[PDB]
Amino acid sequence: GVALGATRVIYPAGQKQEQLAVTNNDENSTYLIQSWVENADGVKDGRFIVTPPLFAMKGKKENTLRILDATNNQLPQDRESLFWMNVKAIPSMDKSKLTENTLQLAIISRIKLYYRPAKLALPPDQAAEKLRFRRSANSLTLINPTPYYLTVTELNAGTRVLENALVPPMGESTVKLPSDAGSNITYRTINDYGALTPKMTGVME
């Protein structure tokens, strides 16, 4: 099958292009690889170009997607902007099941593209600790004062585990809070490298 060499791309502002690996590991299969960029609402967006936008991979082979900056420097310079990278893997002719009725699948892999401005003040490792929480009778709001998108996970309220949340820079995000939810909050985050960050005590706003 086909896989990508990252769960996220950090695009440093001012750089011409960034690379993203694509691999197929099956010598006896051939994939078509289509790639495009969408904005945070999932709409196809042209401020980032992917080349080659369409190509073939025959057998065991590693290829390189190039992600080019086409924003013309129109994005905010004080906060990450969120985009989505889409890589569709289209299989080929399984001539074995020709006489048959078939459900034919293709794979699309969607990972976050973060446009990270140049002279941000707070280093990225220090972002996760700055998360704050606001609590209501049946909802919990996460407050992110940093310029970085925070991907919050292992969110716990007492014994009960909550939805993950994607907290925008200098913004908020809310998740549902069951009745049997406890008082103390812990969370983790997923950092630039795709790893889990250390469990942290949630701090009330």
Partner 1 sequence: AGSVDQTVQLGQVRTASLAQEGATSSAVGFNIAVAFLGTAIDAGHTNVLALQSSAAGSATNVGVQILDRTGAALTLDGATFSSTIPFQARYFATGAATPGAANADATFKVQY
Partner 2 sequence: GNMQFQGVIIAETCRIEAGDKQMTVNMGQISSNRFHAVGEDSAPVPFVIHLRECSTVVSERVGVAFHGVADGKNPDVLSVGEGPGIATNIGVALFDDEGNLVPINRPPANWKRGSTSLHFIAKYRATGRRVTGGIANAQAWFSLTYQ
Asked if residue 32 lies in contact with residue 90, where contact means CB atoms within 8 angstroms, the answer is: yes
Instruction: State how far the Cα of 20 lies from the Cα of 4, in Å rounded to an integer.
Output: 7
Question: Measured from the CB of residue 5, what is the shortest distance to partner 1 in angstroms?
Answer: 5
Q: How many residues does the chain have?
A: 205
Work out whether 89 is an interface residue with partner 2 (CB under 8 A).
yes
For residue 125, the minimal CB distance to partner 1 (Å) is: 4
| Residue numbers at the binding site for partner 1 (CB under 8 A) | 5-6, 21, 123-125, 191-195, 197
Question: In the complex with partner 2, which residue's Cβ is closer, 141 or 164?
Answer: 164
Contact call for residues 36 and 87 (beta carbons, < 8 A)? no
Measured distance CA(11)–CA(201) in Å, rounded? 30
- 7 vs 39, beta carbon nearer partner 1: 7
Q: Which of 44, 58, 60, 110 binds partner 2 (CB under 8 A)?
A: 110
96 binds partner 2 (CB under 8 A): yes
116: left (phi over 0), alpha (psi -120 to 50) or beta: beta
Residues 164-203, one symbol each (x = binds partner 2 by CB under 8 A, - = not), give x-x-----------------------x--xxxx-------
- Cα–Cα dist 41/64, whole Å: 26
Phi, psi at 126, each rounded to 5°: -90, 5
Binding site for partner 2 (CB under 8 A): 1-8, 23, 25-26, 29, 88-89, 91-94, 96-97, 100-112, 151, 153, 164, 166, 190, 193-196
